[PDB]
Amino acid sequence: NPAIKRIGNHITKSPEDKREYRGLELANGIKVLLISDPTTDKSSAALDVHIGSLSDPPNIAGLSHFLQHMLFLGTKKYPKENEYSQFLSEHAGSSNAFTSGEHTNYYFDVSHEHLEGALDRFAQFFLSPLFDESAKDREVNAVDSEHEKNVMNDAWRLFQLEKATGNPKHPFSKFGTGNKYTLETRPNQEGIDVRQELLKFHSAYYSSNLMAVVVLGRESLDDLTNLVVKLFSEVENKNVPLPEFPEHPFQEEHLKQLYKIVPIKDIRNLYVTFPIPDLQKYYKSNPGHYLGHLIGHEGPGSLLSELKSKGWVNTLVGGQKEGARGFMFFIINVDLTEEGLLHVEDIILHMFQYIQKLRAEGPQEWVFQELKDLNAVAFRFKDKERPRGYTSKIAGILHYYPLEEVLTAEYLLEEFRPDLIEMVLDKLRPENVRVAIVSKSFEGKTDRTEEWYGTQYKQEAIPDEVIKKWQNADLNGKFKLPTKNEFIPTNFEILPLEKEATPYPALIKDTAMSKLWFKQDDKFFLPKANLNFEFFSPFAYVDPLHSNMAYLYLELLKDSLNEYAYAAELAGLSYDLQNTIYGMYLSVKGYNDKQPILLKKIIEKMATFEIDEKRFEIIKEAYMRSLNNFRAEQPHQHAMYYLRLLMTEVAWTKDELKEALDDVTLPRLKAFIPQLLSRLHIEALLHGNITKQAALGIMQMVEDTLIEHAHTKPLLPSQLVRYREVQLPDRGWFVYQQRNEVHNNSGIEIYYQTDMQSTSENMFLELFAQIISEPAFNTLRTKEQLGYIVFSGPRRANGIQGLRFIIQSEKPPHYLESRVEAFLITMEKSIEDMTEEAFQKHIQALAIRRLDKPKKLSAESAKYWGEIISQQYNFDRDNTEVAYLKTLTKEDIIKFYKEMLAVDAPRRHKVSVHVLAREMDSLSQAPALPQPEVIQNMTEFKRGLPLFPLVKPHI
Ligand SMILES: CC(C)(C)OC(=O)NC[C@@H](Cc1cnc2ccccc2c1)c1cc(F)ccc1F
Ligand SMILES: [Zn+2]
């Protein structure tokens, strides 16, 4: 009672939110939000310290970040460093943390029973941390792994490069991540004891007055109140003033500047940026959001629509962008066609024409009202969140908003402020602009290099004559304000649960044309529904050409519908449409109210679609580059790709796809579409706020619309063929090797094929994966430091399964091979030793994870959709498999390992894909390994092997 400075009033929440909330401020300055949820499976807490990278000392880049790794390694009360991770591990929890420019955010979840035990261990790091010196070298090699990861990633490159072109004296120029150089090599050379500087930064910065704590649990508001007072009232208050960065990092000499940048992927982008004051304080009227909505609009009369008609760009992003406390940015970013790259000046002229139009028209209240209405709807009917993300998010926002507004924060707009809009719009002018062009056409034409990532670039002043041209922009008649959004939902009725409602989806239609699975939502009760459709056609993947045409068809369909569908997206109604190895996939999600109207427009357009030649050529070129850009993908990404190609009956390569792409002409595509839609089978899942009858009426409308416009007829059952997995021979080991030409890291996937999926085989494999899961990370990543990516787990495809390992390392593939096999023996011993008690803990951990309950509709739909697309239809799977899992013995697992997985197992089926680093040449004891058969030709490999059956569906 005396340890609490004040209690907040009522925490404004949605009427639909049954969780209970209480805000308060501790006497030591800590802001608190408590969340009482008696139904939650997992409890969670989070602490956000309003200090991060921008506050690093200039001579030690990455220190805030480093302190984040170092802070959770042993305290006075809990000496052992593994304690926090261990306790969470033992009680179905997890933890994680992040460091930004102004924040360091620590969070965990745990089983609802063990909140106090977890929060106790958590609270100590903010009372008496030890920072065990033993780990220092490991945590530095960790931070170094992260940076090295991002080095070849174009987005991180652009992020840091922008920083390098501003005022070098401004904290905004800092390198926030750090690496081995900034945390070991340089501070050694300069005679810096990192540890005492770490400790110093902590002492100066980790003040309760800059801390926010969030706790979500089953316990009451009063019990949580007591617990948080008990644990956090002792955090020391050092009255640290909150860092402000009110000088803008781009000053007059950083303006009217042009940057020409070389990317890693063949991408072509234009970035237009305007320095603006910090708008955070105007949050109740949010004038940048207003301008972002309009400048970034995609409906008719939009900036984008005109840039698209002109053939200059495909996509556009607009609006306000965070900086830090004191400074912000307004951006207009576009991608560029080949013609766009030659008309950058004209593109920018058009941007200023639209900006000028918003001036001449002045502010519109009806637009603001629309935004207000949509945000109110969005807040009211917001999906429930996983507790871990929820607490972490709130902890951050506690630093920006009054207690009572912490949930409504990002949602609610109140007052229309025309003056403010006009103020922001006044900064959007040629004299305040910064321009960046990203293009490979600048390769070898650049004089500068960014130190952290190696990025190559050029800088030049924009000529005055250009600025003046932009300043003098006429009004353009192609630009118009949007009209009223007719997709705004108004019917939020939750339909009564039907008498014959089912717990799982039921087959409510089974015809030549369609299989329809349906479940009325009996859990979330929001006015939404998810409508998923799989369209099956043999002509979508028959050869590389057809697969190309499938892709382009749907890309052009989406491009054509975009103006119309954008309004619906703004109104919380969205769709996904993509091609598959079997046909097409369509998903429509969100508010059910106008859902049938959007669906019908899509099905109609699919069938009566008229192609724009100009768009066809542009989209085709963009797709070519997309196929090429896979070369720039990560090595482990490549490894996984190669293995799918290897193990699946039919699969066209990126090389085959691009080779066929030149044969896609407009007349060939126009012929393809009616052919594709001539014969179909549809399998659908309709899940949400809908009745059995409504479901049937939706399916009927989809069928009738295709039948009418495309003359669709059903496929033959014998035509509904799924692809099989390659059956590897007993005691075989095959290796496929390739090189990544971009990254100087290796990638590898090792796949131990087991058998066809079945209740028993599934649980043998999953328990084994459960057992080795933590050890694999601890040994291969933590101890041996093999690389950033270390993964093990079950692999499932085409009714078949096995065990896999994926690793990205500096070390050569064959080396990684011996270490994995070495690890596999370690676990062999380890299972023999392990106590019956420790074994049963593994079973319990697996069970809990498997029975994890979806917290939103989509997460429930996805589980159902999984069963539908695998054609196993096992909706009660979890319960059944857990029940079985519980009957398994330690022997069972030993037997299984010995028959299928052990180096000398009689039924070992091993396939490895090795992807070599850009430069690369073509401890527990590791066992002796046989000579692998090396795959030269994927077709030959496949021809020489049998193909598995397909799994019998659960009926
Ligand atoms: C958004 C991320 C990727 C984090 O990057 C940035 O914050 N800034 C880099 C920024 C792109 C950008 C712009 N102007 C520059 C001027 C000079 C030098 C580099 C620049 C980079 C960017 C903006 C954006 F909205 C989306 C992607 C982006 F890469
Ligand atoms: Zn890190």
XYZ file of N, CA and C in Angstrom, residues 357-540:
552
model
N -1.908 18.699 -54.592
C -3.360 18.445 -54.605
C -3.962 18.408 -53.204
N -3.259 17.805 -52.248
C -3.777 17.728 -50.873
C -3.765 19.111 -50.234
N -2.844 19.964 -50.685
C -2.824 21.368 -50.257
C -4.036 22.123 -50.775
N -4.179 22.152 -52.089
C -5.282 22.822 -52.760
C -6.660 22.316 -52.327
N -6.772 21.058 -51.917
C -8.070 20.559 -51.457
C -8.294 20.862 -49.986
N -7.215 21.001 -49.228
C -7.295 21.152 -47.782
C -7.810 19.904 -47.081
N -7.646 19.849 -45.750
C -8.077 18.723 -44.914
C -9.549 18.344 -45.109
N -9.865 17.055 -44.933
C -11.216 16.508 -45.071
C -11.590 15.754 -43.810
N -12.656 16.192 -43.156
C -13.029 15.594 -41.877
C -13.580 14.200 -42.082
N -14.311 14.007 -43.175
C -14.929 12.714 -43.482
C -13.914 11.586 -43.606
N -12.729 11.910 -44.139
C -11.588 10.986 -44.189
C -11.135 10.654 -42.767
N -10.924 11.688 -41.965
C -10.569 11.493 -40.572
C -11.610 10.633 -39.818
N -12.893 10.952 -39.997
C -13.994 10.197 -39.386
C -13.943 8.715 -39.781
N -13.738 8.454 -41.071
C -13.559 7.085 -41.550
C -12.454 6.344 -40.813
N -11.302 7.005 -40.655
C -10.139 6.403 -39.974
C -10.507 6.083 -38.538
N -11.251 7.005 -37.941
C -11.680 6.923 -36.544
C -12.647 5.743 -36.386
N -13.621 5.682 -37.287
C -14.581 4.581 -37.266
C -13.893 3.216 -37.452
N -12.955 3.128 -38.402
C -12.293 1.850 -38.648
C -11.452 1.373 -37.458
N -10.701 2.299 -36.857
C -9.888 2.012 -35.682
C -10.728 1.592 -34.479
N -11.914 2.201 -34.374
C -12.855 1.829 -33.301
C -13.320 0.395 -33.539
N -13.743 0.094 -34.762
C -14.105 -1.300 -35.081
C -12.932 -2.279 -34.797
N -11.737 -1.914 -35.277
C -10.548 -2.758 -35.155
C -10.175 -3.049 -33.717
N -10.350 -2.037 -32.857
C -10.062 -2.176 -31.445
C -11.102 -3.061 -30.808
N -12.375 -2.760 -31.074
C -13.442 -3.543 -30.462
C -13.283 -5.036 -30.745
N -13.056 -5.362 -32.026
C -13.085 -6.764 -32.441
C -11.678 -7.384 -32.650
N -10.672 -6.768 -32.026
C -9.273 -7.246 -32.041
C -9.128 -8.699 -31.566
N -8.351 -9.526 -32.280
C -8.116 -10.921 -31.877
C -7.377 -10.954 -30.549
N -7.611 -11.989 -29.751
C -6.851 -12.196 -28.511
C -5.414 -12.558 -28.919
N -4.434 -12.160 -28.095
C -2.997 -12.306 -28.396
C -2.389 -13.396 -27.514
N -1.354 -14.071 -28.016
C -0.524 -14.924 -27.156
C 0.050 -14.056 -26.031
N -0.013 -14.529 -24.770
C 0.397 -13.678 -23.636
C 1.809 -13.082 -23.749
N 2.767 -13.839 -24.298
C 4.160 -13.394 -24.385
C 4.342 -12.142 -25.237
N 3.726 -12.127 -26.418
C 3.733 -10.954 -27.286
C 2.982 -9.799 -26.652
N 1.896 -10.118 -25.946
C 1.020 -9.122 -25.339
C 1.759 -8.300 -24.254
N 2.437 -8.986 -23.330
C 3.121 -8.304 -22.241
C 4.311 -7.460 -22.751
N 5.091 -8.041 -23.656
C 6.236 -7.371 -24.236
C 5.800 -6.079 -24.915
N 4.767 -6.167 -25.748
C 4.216 -4.997 -26.441
C 3.778 -3.902 -25.469
N 3.055 -4.288 -24.416
C 2.471 -3.319 -23.490
C 3.563 -2.603 -22.681
N 4.531 -3.371 -22.192
C 5.686 -2.821 -21.477
C 6.321 -1.618 -22.224
N 6.418 -1.719 -23.552
C 6.968 -0.650 -24.347
C 6.056 0.555 -24.348
N 4.766 0.300 -24.564
C 3.828 1.384 -24.742
C 3.472 2.084 -23.444
N 3.777 1.444 -22.316
C 3.650 2.080 -21.003
C 4.486 3.366 -20.889
N 5.615 3.416 -21.600
C 6.474 4.586 -21.594
C 5.938 5.752 -22.404
N 4.927 5.543 -23.246
C 4.427 6.641 -24.105
C 3.030 7.159 -23.763
N 2.250 6.353 -23.041
C 0.821 6.687 -22.840
C 0.403 6.594 -21.367
N -0.577 7.421 -20.940
C -1.114 7.267 -19.577
C -1.617 5.848 -19.352
N -1.453 5.349 -18.134
C -1.984 4.053 -17.705
C -3.328 3.649 -18.349
N -4.316 4.535 -18.254
C -5.684 4.246 -18.698
C -5.776 4.086 -20.206
N -4.749 4.547 -20.916
C -4.763 4.515 -22.373
C -3.833 3.462 -23.004
N -3.199 2.651 -22.175
C -2.245 1.667 -22.659
C -2.807 0.653 -23.684
N -4.098 0.318 -23.608
C -4.672 -0.600 -24.583
C -5.239 0.106 -25.799
N -5.839 1.272 -25.604
C -6.430 2.035 -26.719
C -5.400 2.790 -27.558
N -4.249 3.043 -26.927
C -3.064 3.747 -27.467
C -2.976 3.914 -28.992
N -2.667 2.807 -29.641
C -2.414 2.745 -31.069
C -3.686 2.770 -31.903
N -4.841 2.704 -31.240
C -6.116 2.644 -31.940
C -6.874 3.964 -32.018
N -7.190 4.568 -30.882
C -8.251 5.560 -30.914
C -7.770 6.954 -31.235
N -8.458 7.538 -32.211
C -8.344 8.923 -32.636
C -9.537 9.674 -32.049
N -9.317 10.916 -31.614
C -10.382 11.735 -31.020
C -10.673 12.990 -31.819
N -9.762 13.956 -31.819
C -10.071 15.257 -32.390
C -9.476 15.473 -33.793
N -10.294 15.956 -34.730
C -9.833 16.387 -36.058
C -9.021 17.673 -35.944
N -7.735 17.609 -36.281
C -6.892 18.786 -36.189
C -6.339 19.291 -37.519
N -7.167 20.046 -38.291
C -6.783 20.476 -39.660
C -5.468 21.246 -39.710
N -5.239 22.050 -38.670
C -4.048 22.875 -38.526
C -2.798 22.012 -38.525
N -2.788 20.978 -37.686
C -1.661 20.039 -37.607
C -1.353 19.341 -38.944
N -2.400 18.914 -39.643
C -2.244 18.258 -40.934
C -1.513 19.210 -41.856
N -1.951 20.467 -41.826
C -1.410 21.486 -42.692
C 0.046 21.731 -42.333
N 0.337 21.697 -41.038
C 1.700 21.848 -40.560
C 2.634 20.753 -41.134
N 2.189 19.492 -41.117
C 3.036 18.383 -41.552
C 3.210 18.453 -43.072
N 2.108 18.677 -43.756
C 2.093 18.859 -45.210
C 3.036 19.968 -45.716
N 3.261 20.969 -44.871
C 4.153 22.073 -45.197
C 5.630 21.647 -45.219
N 5.978 20.588 -44.480
C 7.327 20.008 -44.511
C 7.586 19.114 -45.739
N 6.520 18.607 -46.330
C 6.651 17.748 -47.486
C 6.920 18.562 -48.759
N 8.117 19.145 -48.863
C 8.468 20.062 -49.968
C 9.862 19.763 -50.558
N 10.090 20.117 -51.844
C 11.377 19.820 -52.529
C 12.615 20.280 -51.760
N 12.512 21.449 -51.128
C 13.617 21.997 -50.363
C 13.999 21.152 -49.134
N 13.122 20.234 -48.737
C 13.372 19.396 -47.539
C 13.641 17.905 -47.911
N 13.934 17.608 -49.179
C 13.859 16.193 -49.615
C 15.189 15.428 -49.581
N 15.102 14.115 -49.427
C 16.268 13.245 -49.570
C 15.863 12.067 -50.468
N 16.708 11.734 -51.427
C 16.343 10.742 -52.443
C 17.409 9.640 -52.496
N 16.966 8.393 -52.501
C 17.889 7.263 -52.679
C 17.398 6.326 -53.773
N 18.285 5.977 -54.702
C 17.946 5.039 -55.771
C 18.802 3.773 -55.531
N 18.143 2.617 -55.478
C 18.862 1.345 -55.298
C 18.779 0.584 -56.618
N 19.928 0.236 -57.198
C 19.967 -0.397 -58.535
C 21.337 -0.991 -58.854
N 21.339 -2.167 -59.496
C 22.614 -2.787 -59.899
C 23.265 -2.003 -61.036
N 22.497 -1.130 -61.711
C 23.044 -0.286 -62.782
C 24.091 0.719 -62.293
N 24.286 0.765 -60.960
C 25.292 1.617 -60.337
C 26.557 0.806 -59.977
N 26.579 -0.500 -60.294
C 27.742 -1.373 -60.029
C 28.964 -0.793 -60.715
N 30.039 -0.597 -59.961
C 31.249 0.003 -60.525
C 31.177 1.502 -60.819
N 30.102 2.181 -60.420
C 29.994 3.625 -60.665
C 29.884 4.382 -59.340
N 30.317 3.738 -58.257
C 30.253 4.326 -56.918
C 31.646 4.504 -56.287
N 31.809 5.599 -55.542
C 33.079 5.913 -54.862
C 33.099 5.680 -53.354
N 31.961 5.439 -52.709
C 32.004 5.258 -51.237
C 31.641 3.856 -50.778
N 32.000 3.537 -49.545
C 31.761 2.237 -48.956
C 31.359 2.433 -47.477
N 30.261 1.798 -47.066
C 29.799 1.895 -45.690
C 30.565 0.831 -44.876
N 31.091 1.222 -43.728
C 32.027 0.378 -43.031
C 31.442 -0.872 -42.419
N 30.191 -0.828 -41.979
C 29.687 -1.936 -41.192
C 29.265 -3.098 -42.013
N 28.722 -2.813 -43.203
C 28.161 -3.851 -44.076
C 28.909 -3.981 -45.411
N 29.719 -2.987 -45.757
C 30.440 -3.032 -47.013
C 29.662 -2.448 -48.178
N 28.531 -1.799 -47.890
C 27.614 -1.312 -48.938
C 28.247 -0.266 -49.850
N 28.011 -0.367 -51.150
C 28.662 0.550 -52.093
C 27.698 1.641 -52.561
N 28.127 2.898 -52.519
C 27.204 3.991 -52.838
C 27.923 5.242 -53.271
N 27.126 6.139 -53.844
C 27.566 7.425 -54.351
C 26.631 8.496 -53.766
N 27.161 9.687 -53.500
C 26.314 10.803 -53.102
C 26.536 12.036 -54.011
N 25.456 12.748 -54.335
C 25.502 13.959 -55.161
C 24.416 14.930 -54.695
N 24.617 16.214 -54.963
C 23.600 17.221 -54.675
C 22.563 17.136 -55.762
N 21.290 17.301 -55.414
C 20.268 17.450 -56.462
C 20.420 18.848 -57.091
N 20.463 18.933 -58.434
C 20.585 20.258 -59.068
C 19.413 21.148 -58.693
N 19.692 22.441 -58.502
C 18.691 23.447 -58.134
C 17.558 23.493 -59.136
N 17.914 23.271 -60.389
C 16.980 23.339 -61.491
C 15.960 22.226 -61.345
N 16.369 21.103 -60.731
C 15.463 19.969 -60.498
C 14.498 20.285 -59.354
N 15.067 20.778 -58.254
C 14.314 21.211 -57.081
C 13.241 22.223 -57.483
N 13.639 23.186 -58.317
C 12.782 24.258 -58.815
C 11.640 23.677 -59.648
N 11.965 22.750 -60.556
C 10.937 22.010 -61.319
C 9.912 21.350 -60.395
N 10.387 20.690 -59.339
C 9.511 20.040 -58.365
C 8.697 21.046 -57.619
N 9.329 22.131 -57.172
C 8.595 23.261 -56.562
C 7.464 23.837 -57.420
N 7.621 23.805 -58.740
C 6.664 24.465 -59.637
C 5.597 23.555 -60.225
N 5.391 22.412 -59.580
C 4.538 21.360 -60.137
C 3.085 21.802 -60.327
N 2.617 21.716 -61.577
C 1.213 21.949 -61.945
C 0.327 20.985 -61.186
N -0.963 21.265 -61.167
C -1.879 20.280 -60.664
C -2.133 19.281 -61.801
N -2.204 17.993 -61.451
C -2.416 16.869 -62.390
C -3.844 16.316 -62.178
N -4.631 16.258 -63.256
C -6.048 15.857 -63.196
C -6.276 14.377 -62.924
N -5.242 13.565 -63.148
C -5.284 12.144 -62.808
C -5.440 11.888 -61.301
N -5.072 12.848 -60.456
C -5.136 12.663 -59.001
C -6.450 13.138 -58.432
N -7.043 12.298 -57.577
C -8.297 12.592 -56.882
C -8.261 11.971 -55.507
N -8.952 12.603 -54.561
C -9.170 12.016 -53.249
C -9.971 10.731 -53.381
N -9.757 9.774 -52.460
C -10.627 8.605 -52.486
C -12.096 8.971 -52.220
N -13.011 8.106 -52.654
C -14.424 8.197 -52.282
C -14.732 7.349 -51.033
N -15.980 7.420 -50.576
C -16.411 6.770 -49.357
C -16.100 5.262 -49.451
N -15.566 4.692 -48.380
C -15.225 3.297 -48.392
C -16.487 2.518 -48.095
N -17.028 1.877 -49.127
C -18.273 1.134 -49.025
C -18.064 -0.240 -48.425
N -16.813 -0.579 -48.091
C -16.524 -1.877 -47.468
C -16.538 -1.820 -45.941
N -16.698 -0.621 -45.388
C -16.796 -0.481 -43.927
C -17.897 -1.401 -43.380
N -17.561 -2.302 -42.441
C -18.569 -3.246 -41.964
C -19.518 -2.587 -40.968
N -20.785 -3.034 -40.954
C -21.816 -2.524 -40.024
C -22.611 -3.645 -39.357
N -22.613 -4.833 -39.956
C -23.280 -5.961 -39.346
C -22.354 -6.852 -38.501
N -22.443 -6.711 -37.180
C -21.545 -7.410 -36.280
C -22.261 -8.461 -35.475
N -23.445 -8.839 -35.936
C -24.198 -9.885 -35.271
C -23.443 -11.213 -35.176
N -23.312 -11.736 -33.958
C -22.828 -13.078 -33.783
C -24.036 -14.002 -33.860
N -24.079 -14.851 -34.881
C -25.194 -15.763 -35.084
C -25.234 -16.803 -33.970
N -26.457 -17.155 -33.498
C -26.565 -18.154 -32.434
C -25.934 -19.454 -32.878
N -25.285 -20.133 -31.943
C -24.730 -21.445 -32.196
C -25.829 -22.460 -32.572
N -25.708 -23.084 -33.745
C -26.747 -24.008 -34.260
C -26.869 -25.253 -33.383
N -28.052 -25.874 -33.369
C -28.267 -27.088 -32.567
C -27.299 -28.201 -32.952
N -27.032 -28.306 -34.251
C -26.167 -29.345 -34.812
C -24.772 -28.820 -35.133
N -24.283 -27.870 -34.335
C -22.911 -27.396 -34.427
C -21.961 -28.513 -33.975
N -20.759 -28.558 -34.555
C -19.756 -29.610 -34.266
C -18.472 -29.015 -33.658
N -17.756 -29.800 -32.823
C -16.492 -29.320 -32.285
C -15.383 -29.174 -33.336
N -15.426 -30.018 -34.365
C -14.416 -29.985 -35.430
C -15.123 -29.763 -36.749
N -14.392 -29.457 -37.846
C -15.095 -29.267 -39.122
C -15.757 -30.552 -39.613
N -16.949 -30.437 -40.197
C -17.625 -31.612 -40.726
C -17.770 -31.524 -42.238
N -17.771 -32.672 -42.895
C -17.933 -32.698 -44.332
C -19.402 -32.459 -44.718
N -19.731 -31.268 -45.191
C -21.134 -30.960 -45.410
C -21.525 -31.022 -46.871
N -20.539 -31.304 -47.721
C -20.786 -31.500 -49.136
C -19.626 -32.308 -49.709
N -19.953 -33.293 -50.537
C -18.953 -34.162 -51.149
C -19.458 -34.515 -52.534
N -19.103 -33.709 -53.533
C -19.570 -33.904 -54.915
C -18.392 -34.031 -55.858
N -18.681 -34.313 -57.128
C -17.651 -34.311 -58.166
C -16.899 -32.980 -58.179
N -17.614 -31.882 -58.002
C -16.950 -30.604 -58.060
C -16.297 -30.149 -56.755
N -16.917 -30.439 -55.610
C -16.409 -29.920 -54.340
C -16.537 -30.775 -53.094
N -15.519 -30.677 -52.241
C -15.530 -31.224 -50.912
C -15.573 -29.978 -49.976
N -16.607 -29.857 -49.133
C -16.768 -28.668 -48.264
C -16.680 -29.039 -46.791
N -15.657 -28.533 -46.082
C -15.540 -28.697 -44.630
C -16.029 -27.464 -43.936
N -16.843 -27.640 -42.893
C -17.486 -26.506 -42.203
C -17.523 -26.689 -40.694
N -17.202 -25.600 -39.994
C -17.380 -25.466 -38.557
C -17.827 -24.053 -38.230
N -18.899 -23.948 -37.454
C -19.282 -22.654 -36.904
C -18.345 -22.412 -35.719
N -17.799 -21.209 -35.634
C -16.958 -20.807 -34.497
C -17.689 -21.046 -33.162
N -17.091 -21.830 -32.275
C -17.653 -21.995 -30.921
C -16.666 -21.545 -29.796
N -15.771 -20.603 -30.099
C -14.694 -20.205 -29.191
C -14.429 -18.711 -29.060
N -14.473 -17.965 -30.160
C -13.937 -16.600 -30.125
C -15.043 -15.535 -30.222
N -16.070 -15.802 -31.026
C -17.324 -15.075 -30.986
C -17.125 -13.636 -31.434
N -16.257 -13.457 -32.423
C -16.037 -12.154 -33.062
C -16.690 -12.207 -34.439
N -17.060 -11.046 -35.016
C -17.888 -11.165 -36.230
C -17.030 -11.371 -37.484
N -16.303 -12.482 -37.475
C -15.352 -12.784 -38.537
C -15.513 -14.225 -39.010
N -14.904 -14.529 -40.142
C -14.885 -15.862 -40.714
C -13.672 -15.989 -41.691
N -13.168 -17.208 -41.826
C -12.071 -17.542 -42.719
C -12.587 -18.516 -43.764
N -12.428 -18.162 -45.034
C -12.951 -18.977 -46.090
C -11.786 -19.374 -47.014
N -11.370 -20.641 -46.930
C -10.244 -21.178 -47.660
C -10.696 -22.113 -48.772
N -10.135 -21.914 -49.960
C -10.449 -22.722 -51.146
C -9.155 -23.224 -51.818
N -9.065 -24.535 -52.051
C -8.002 -25.148 -52.859
C -8.665 -25.547 -54.189
N -8.227 -24.947 -55.313
C -8.676 -25.289 -56.668
C -7.649 -26.255 -57.278
N -8.079 -27.473 -57.610
C -7.188 -28.485 -58.175
C -7.353 -28.536 -59.675
N -6.237 -28.442 -60.391
C -6.200 -28.585 -61.855
C -4.878 -29.228 -62.294
N -4.918 -30.271 -63.148
C -3.673 -30.876 -63.664
C -2.844 -29.924 -64.517
N -3.472 -28.853 -65.016
C -2.787 -27.904 -65.896
C -2.031 -26.768 -65.203
N -1.962 -26.811 -63.872
C -1.252 -25.767 -63.137
C 0.227 -26.083 -62.956
